[PDB]
Amino acid sequence: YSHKFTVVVLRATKVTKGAFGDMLDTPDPYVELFISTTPDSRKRTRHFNNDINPVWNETFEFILDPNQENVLEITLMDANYVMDETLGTATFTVSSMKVGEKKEVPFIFNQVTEMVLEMSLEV
């Protein structure tokens, strides 16, 4: 744990679903931040139900060694009441990047889903 890696889940609007999640009400947004290199990078953001235009913009720091396979395994899911439902996940190997600034990654799922993740690398 010697490399400074900061991530910031910005937004995740136009999150599509259908009638499935609409059973109770409009889709239920909820993020799931997962990584592969740290001891146990299994964090997430518990948002709410009925919402296709949420905004977390939460910056979580992660000082870990980039010697392993730093695979930023994020996952935009749907927070249910029994079992979560993944809608669109993302993966980005940060162990090998051009550290020096932030990173506005445009991650659109399907076609209308839009989720921007701002992560800045440093050491």
- Interface with Ca ion (CB under 5 A): 21, 24-25, 28, 49-50, 78, 80
CA–CA gap between residue 5 and residue 46 (Å, rounded): 22
Nearer to Ca ion, 4 or 88 (CB): 88
In the complex, the smallest distance separating the C-beta of residue 51 from Ca ion, rounded to whole angstroms, is 8
DSSP 8-state secondary structure symbol assigned to residue 22: G
User: Is 65 marked within a binding site?
Assistant: no
Report whether 59 belongs to an annotated binding site. Answer: no
Nearer to Ca ion, 25 or 104 (CB): 25
Cβ 53 to Ca ion shortest distance, Å: 14
- Whichever of 25 and 61 has its CB closer to Ca ion, that residue is 25
Residue 9 and residue 57 in contact, taking contact as beta carbons nearer than 8 Å: yes
Measured from the CB of residue 82, what is the shortest distance to Ca ion in angstroms? Answer: 9
What is the smallest separation between the CB atom of 81 and Ca ion, expressed in angstroms?
A: 7
Any known ligand binding at 51? no
22 marked ligand binding residue: no
Which H helix or E strand runs over 73? strand 71-78
Can you give the length of the chain in residues?
123
Rounded CA-CA distance 47/106 in Å is: 20
Contacts of 7 (CB under 8 A, 6+ apart): 33, 59, 60, 62, 72, 74, 117, 118, 119
Known binding residues for Ca(2+) are: 25-26, 28, 50, 78-80
